[PDB]
Design a protein around this nucleic acid. Structure first.
Lengths: 99, 50, 161, 288, 98, 100
DNA sequence: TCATGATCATAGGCGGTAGCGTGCGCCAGACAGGG
DNA sequence: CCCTGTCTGGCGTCCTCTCACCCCTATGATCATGA
């Protein structure tokens, strides 16, 4: 079975990408597992914002990496093959893995 | 007029022609017209009919 | 009545060479084996390497050519000139046994070849036989944003579907 | 656009490579399952462009706000089909090849460039003689044409530093080893000193050719084709006769014959030619 | 027979020939000589660039005629570009200077 | 930082790149308990011979823009100051001010 | 179940154990023959 | 080298209209029927 791991910083974008892959799957094959949301990675960073010295002066950024697990239970001939020509929107790292 | 348009050189002179070259007539006439107008010696010709 | 290289025709030696090897006539051509999956089937044929180039022993004058024309073995002599050129037999004399170049089976694949892996829909991309393991089936040598899987394909298919 | 002159000259093989967008390698034209052409034969898509406008062969780009990006599957730059009227391709000939317009136009430019009559050049270019290049300190001249027995003599007695070749490689070495400055000075000195009217007329024609060849920017070895262009595919169209078949134009037949013969010559130079054998195939390619 | 604007040939972008094919009459070579023999210069320019061959020129012409502006944007005959490709497909290097 | 410092570092990086295999092999030899004493000694002396800039522990991480040694961050390869500028200007993807 | 025969579909450049060509004409310029 | 014959390249009106013609033959493979 094909596990698919979508990763992105924008959550709307990743959602769009999840949808689109699901459609790609459903037309060709059958029994798409589903778009399961895994936990988001909130990597935080603190930095001093002064050029020279003001230590309590700080800014706290973060990057929210969003995960979407989509799974395909029955890999057919047509379905797996669709994805090659079906590239997704940019800023979305996908990761397919059969078995 | 459009028949006898070429010409052949006899003395190349101070220009850049040959002794048996067959160059067109108006070219050699403006060439020795601009050679002879100053203190030089031009290039003389002879006509052939085509 | 000697060795002469002629541009000839193919595959049916033994009849024009019945005319010939009816005598002690001599014949030769470069050599090669061919493993070629013709139509879903690996076939092995050690056939002559060359096209119509072929060494034949015969004698020119008394036996005139137009009589013998009606057969194969006839494109024309090695010439480099108007006259039928007396050819050397370098292989026969000083180069008997060869073809260690390879058995490349000219342009037909061995394991690990880089060519088309899928047709129909998914093809528009030279995916790769990381191994023609057996001409049967797998899941492609495809590469997107995950692991590079190898062939997705059935017997007659992984190559030119 | 705007222009005031049409310049004509010979074309270097780098110029033919710089016109060309790809290389034709196979002689197939259409698939005749569909009419999607075969990669990369005469009618191509990744050499010459897409058949349909902004219609990528694989199909992945068709947006008004998505123009400029090329395809990845078939690698066809989603543009216009007018570009199949202007893109050219090139064929890499496996062995060099004499152009016919400079060999048999009466007068022969290769003829009265080399100071060599046309019959010797035809007997060298069709692989049925031997001409000498780099004769060395032997009995033999430079422009001396030979035969089979004389080459046997010259390779028995002088199998060392003596050299001689045949075919278009030999003519290319003759034309490349031609020094034009020495020929200009020698012909001017001879027409100063010889003064015989047959020699006068012949040598002044040859020095007219040499001054018109030195003053321009040509080279003598460009008259032997190494790389051969192909015409763009809209200008050699493949008409249907509405009967399931294509009565093809004559050009695709000619290019198909050259590519068949060239691929067979590449394969015969690959798997080694039988000594005095890699010659008939080059004669066939020259004649095609 | 009469033709305003019909189909166009494929290899050289000129109108087709005949009546069954909806075609235009051949403005032959001696008619070109007969218009050189007058002083008609714009008539010959549109007679062999706008009306016949240049595709962007004739679409500009059709828009300009249906809008009332009698004016031609000349351009180049496309069949001259075909001549450049056929001479260039030999070993000959023809160009366009400046 | 200065140009010279940046150059020194680049050099050091180059050297680390160069001598990685050998230095690692030597470290392995020295570690290997199942090995001859003299061999181990040779290895440690050989390590001494190699250049000092060959060590990875010599190279300091700087800002890839300014070369500032302190205030560095690994994910971005930038010093805090330039990183902040990047967040503000939009050029770091995904990064935005965080509150919770 | 196996073998043989018949029918249908798909695939390339004188056709042959040679010879086919044969009813334009002028000019012109180079290539070569004779002396 | 100076003629003088041979050879092979060039060229031979414009515009339009109509019509036909534009692989068949051979070999190989598959299926069906009969023994």
């Amino acid at each position: 079975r094909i596990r698919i791991r979508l990763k992105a910083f924008d959550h709307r974008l990743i959602d769009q990408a999840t949808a689109e892959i699901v459609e790609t799957a459903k037309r060709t094959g059958a029994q798409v597992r589903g778009p399961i949301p895994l936990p988001t990675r909130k990597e935080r960073f603190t930095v001093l914002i002064s050029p020279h010295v003001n230590k309590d002066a700080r800014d706290q950024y973060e990057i929210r990496t969003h995960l979407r697990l989509v799974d395909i239970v029955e890999p057919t001939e047509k379905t797996v093959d669709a994805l090659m020509r079906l590239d997704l929107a940019a800023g979305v790292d996908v990761q397919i893995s059969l078995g | 007029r459009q028949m006898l348009r070429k010409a052949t050189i006899v003395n190349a002179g101070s220009s850049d022609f040959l002794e048996g070259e067959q160059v067109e007539y108006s070219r050699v006439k403006i060439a020795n017209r601009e050679l002879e107008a100053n203190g030089k010696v031009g290039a003389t010709y002879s006509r052939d009919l085509l | 009545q000697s060795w002469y290289l002629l541009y000839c025709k193919r595959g049916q030696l033994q009849r024009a060479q019945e005319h010939l090897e009816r005598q002690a006539v001599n014949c030769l051509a470069p050599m090669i084996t061919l493993e070629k999956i013709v139509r879903g089937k690996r076939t092995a044929v050690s056939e002559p390497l060359f096209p119509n180039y072929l060494f034949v022993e015969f004698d020119p004058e008394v036996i005139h050519t137009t009589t013998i024309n009606a057969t194969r073995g006839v494109s024309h002599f090695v010439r480099f000139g108007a006259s039928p050129a007396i050819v050397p037999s370098a292989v026969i004399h000083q180069l008997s046994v060869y073809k260690p170049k390879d058995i490349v089976d000219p342009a037909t694949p061995y394991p690990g070849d880089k060519v088309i892996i899928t047709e129909g829909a998914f093809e528009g991309f030279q995916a790769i036989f990381t191994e023609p393991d057996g001409e049967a089936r797998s899941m492609l040598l495809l590469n997107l944003i995950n692991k590079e899987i190898k062939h997705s394909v059935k017997n007659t298919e992984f190559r030119k579907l | 656009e705007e222009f005031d002159a049409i310049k004509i000259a010979l074309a270097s093989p780098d110029m033919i490579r710089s016109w060309s967008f790809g290389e034709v390698k196979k002689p197939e034209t259409i698939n005749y399952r569909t009419f999607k052409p075969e990669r990369d034969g005469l009618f191509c898509a990744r050499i010459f462009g897409p058949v349909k406008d902004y219609e990528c062969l694989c199909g992945k780009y068709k947006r008004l706000k998505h123009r400029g990006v090329i395809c990845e599957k078939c690698g066809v730059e989603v543009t216009q089909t007018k570009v199949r009227r202007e893109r050219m391709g090139h064929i890499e000939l496996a062995s060099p090849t004499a152009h016919i317009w400079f060999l048999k136009s009466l007068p022969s430019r290769i003829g009265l460039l080399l100071d060599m009559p046309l019959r010797d050049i035809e007997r060298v270019l069709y692989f049925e003689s031997y001409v000498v290049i780099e004769g060395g300190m032997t009995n033999l001249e430079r422009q001396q044409i030979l035969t089979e027995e004389q080459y046997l003599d010259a390779l028995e007695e002088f199998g060392d530093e003596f050299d001689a070749k045949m075919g278009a490689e030999a003519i290319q070495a003759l034309l490349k080893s031609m020094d034009l400055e020495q020929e200009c000075e020698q012909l001017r000195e001879e027409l100063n000193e010889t003064n015989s009217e047959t020699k006068r007329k012949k040598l002044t024609k040859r020095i007219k050719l040499l001054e018109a060849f030195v003053q321009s920017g040509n080279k003598p070895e460009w008259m032997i084709l190494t790389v051969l262009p192909v015409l763009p595919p809209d200008l050699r169209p493949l008409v249907p006769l509405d009967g399931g078949r294509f009565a093809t134009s004559d050009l695709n037949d000619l290019y198909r014959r050259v590519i068949n013969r060239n691929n067979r010559l590449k394969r015969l130079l690959d798997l080694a030619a039988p000594d005095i054998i890699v010659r008939n195939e080059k004669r066939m390619l020259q004649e095609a | 027979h009469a033709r305003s604007t019909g189909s166009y040939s494929l290899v050289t972008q000129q109108p087709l020939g005949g009546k069954a094919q909806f075609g235009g009459q051949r403005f032959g070579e001696m008619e070109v000589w007969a218009l050189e023999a007058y002083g008609a210069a714009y008539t010959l320019q549109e007679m062999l660039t706008v009306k016949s061959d240049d595709v962007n020129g004739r679409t500009k012409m059709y828009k300009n005629i249906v809008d009332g502006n009698h004016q031609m944007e000349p351009g180049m005959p496309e069949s001259f570009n075909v001549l450049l490709k056929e001479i260039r497909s030999l070993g000959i290097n023809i160009e366009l200077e400046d | 930082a200065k140009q010279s410092m940046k150059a020194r570092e680049v050099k050091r990086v180059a050297l680390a790149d160069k001598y990685f295999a050998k230095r690692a092999e030597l470290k392995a030899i020295i570690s290997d308990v199942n090995a001859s004493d003299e061999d181990r000694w040779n290895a440690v002396l050989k390590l001494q011979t190699l250049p000092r800039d060959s060590s990875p522990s010599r190279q300091r991480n700087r800002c890839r823009q300014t070369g500032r040694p302190h205030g560095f961050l690994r994910k971005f390869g930038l010093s805090r100051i330039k990183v902040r500028e990047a967040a503000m200007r939009g050029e770091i993807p995904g990064l935005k001010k965080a509150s919770w």
